[PDB]
Each structure stands twice: as structure tokens, then as C-alpha cells.
Design an enzyme around this catalytic site. Sequence first.
Site, PDB file in Angstrom:
ATOM      1  N   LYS A 171      -2.944 -28.828 -13.965  1.00  0.00           N
ATOM      2  CA  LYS A 171      -1.871 -29.182 -14.675  1.00  0.00           C
ATOM      3  C   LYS A 171      -2.056 -30.145 -15.887  1.00  0.00           C
ATOM      4  CE  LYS A 171       1.162 -29.232 -11.103  1.00  0.00           C
ATOM      5  NZ  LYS A 171       2.089 -29.660  -9.925  1.00  0.00           N
ATOM      6  N   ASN A 203       6.146 -27.014  -7.594  1.00  0.00           N
ATOM      7  CA  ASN A 203       7.148 -26.710  -6.853  1.00  0.00           C
ATOM      8  C   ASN A 203       7.507 -25.069  -6.587  1.00  0.00           C
ATOM      9  OD1 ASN A 203       8.662 -27.399  -4.637  1.00  0.00           O
ATOM     10  ND2 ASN A 203      10.705 -27.292  -6.109  1.00  0.00           N
ATOM     11  N   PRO A 257       5.774 -26.121 -16.595  1.00  0.00           N
ATOM     12  CA  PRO A 257       4.879 -27.083 -16.393  1.00  0.00           C
ATOM     13  C   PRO A 257       3.969 -27.060 -15.046  1.00  0.00           C
ATOM     14  CG  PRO A 257       6.875 -27.861 -17.217  1.00  0.00           C
ATOM     15  CD  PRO A 257       7.024 -26.430 -16.892  1.00  0.00           C
ATOM     16  N   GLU A 258       3.914 -25.826 -14.557  1.00  0.00           N
ATOM     17  CA  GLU A 258       2.807 -25.879 -13.632  1.00  0.00           C
ATOM     18  C   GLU A 258       1.702 -25.107 -14.041  1.00  0.00           C
ATOM     19  OE1 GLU A 258       4.193 -24.358  -9.856  1.00  0.00           O
ATOM     20  OE2 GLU A 258       6.045 -25.379 -10.206  1.00  0.00           O
TER      21      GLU A 258
END
Length: 268
Positions: free
Chosen positions: A53, A175, A1-2
Site C-alpha cells: 500500500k 477492505n 487506495p489498496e
Amino acid sequence: PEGPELHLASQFVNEACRALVFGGCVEKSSVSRNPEVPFESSAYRISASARGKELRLILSPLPGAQPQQEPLALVFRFGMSGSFQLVPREELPRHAHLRFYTAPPGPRLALCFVDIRRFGRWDLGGKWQPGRGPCVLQEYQQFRENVLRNLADKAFDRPICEALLDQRFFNGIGNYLRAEILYRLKIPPFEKARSVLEALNPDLLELCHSVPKEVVQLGGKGYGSSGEEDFAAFRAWLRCYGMPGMSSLQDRHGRTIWFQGDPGPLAP
DNA sequence: CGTCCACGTCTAC
DNA sequence: TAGACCTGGACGG
């Protein structure tokens, strides 16, 4: 999910739906707090594009389809677990929150937005989120300008590791990409953002593009890849995020930043 | 059994 | 600047 996964997911929708025709309603699982998709057509095609995103799906009726229906756009954010799958109609994965159904000639499939934690979100209407900066993969030049023309913003008073998550200037970086970006240049995660950026071989804004771009070129599912093939590739690509030998610390929002060496001046 | 941890926003005090 | 929002895997006792 980046950004790399959103981008891979949109290519996946485009390739896997290249020759499909969908029909009928757009179906939402019961437990999802996202809005219902009012959209019905007897024959429609699905395409996508990513930005940052976010991912956009376009539902496009074929000529003559019934009900009358104009093209509809939906925008998805994936949260911590969002993904898309193409599965057989009667073998829905457990957390398929939104489902699109193929139409006859051929085997019955369902394209599903699958999202186990339900941090994901969609909106009717097809607009990118106001306020997100340009995509670091697909709009590099605009991305780089929007950062440099704005270093006075209070966002840049923060550590470079926290600034890299801010989607107003780094739409797409999450992250794992921050730790990987910072580690390629050995920038202490806790340097002040503005100091690393004012200055204006690849520099940090270039790595914000080509780094996520390397994940895209591995192909596969990226972070979402453990039976593996995809997964072993991704884990082999990571130099820093979660690696043995590395340090990690919490930033001011409780997110873990991996790095090597000096934590940098603003560290907790 | 239980605690911690995870690829990210959101709204509300 | 804290939480809230969620499921499930890894691992501990």
C-alpha cells in the site's frame, strides 16, 4: 487506495511521464501538514514503483541539470482517497496537495498527488515503512514466508478478517480485497486466523496475491474508478464487497466486512 | 437542513 | 482499544 490501486498509480506515473521532463520546485498546497519537498532541478524525470500500500517516486535530474541535485526518493501512502493525476498546469483539481511541473518544449502539465480527505502521507527519504511486510503482488514468496514463519504472533490470535488488514503480514490488502479473498474460499470472516493458516485449489495465501492481481489486470483505476468504463469493469469484478444478498458486520475496529453465510466462531 | 458512510492509518489515554 | 484526522456523496425529513 489498496495494493492494486497503488500499483496502477505507479504504472500510471511511469507511462504518462515516459516522455516528460519536469523543472523547477516541488510545490505543496498550503493546507497540507506533510513536509515540504526541498528539491529543485531545471530538468528532471519522474518514475515510480509500488510496494504493498505504498508508492515510491523517484525524481531524477537529467545530465547537466541545475541546481546540482542528487536523485530524490519520496514515499507516499494514499489514505482513503489518495491518487495521482497529470493535468494542465492551470487546471489543478481541487485537492492537489503536491505538484510537479513540466518544463517548456511542449504543453505545461502538472503531475499532482490528489487527496481529498488528506489521510494520505508522504515522507522524505525513500524508505518503505519499517514494519510493513512484503508486497503481496510483487514479492509473493517473501510475503508467504513471512506469514508462515510467524504464526505465533499475537496478530494471528485474531479473526482472519482482521488479520488480513494487518500490514505487517498483508501489505496491500484493504477492505474490499479481504471480503473478496474470503469469499472465494468461503472462509468465515470470523474464523481465527492462526487456524486457517496453520495447515499451511489456491489456498488463502495464494489468493492474497492473485486476487489483487486480477484487479491490476482489469487496468484502469480500480477502486478509484463512475462516468465509468473503468468503473463498470471494477464493479462487475466484485462478487462480494457491498453486493446485494451478502451479509456484513463490523470488526473490532469498526470496519465493515462483507461475506456470505456463516459469520464464523469469533463474531461479535 | 441532517445522519450515515467510504479503498487507512496514527498517537495518545 | 477509542478517538482523530477529513471531504463529499447518498439519502432522509
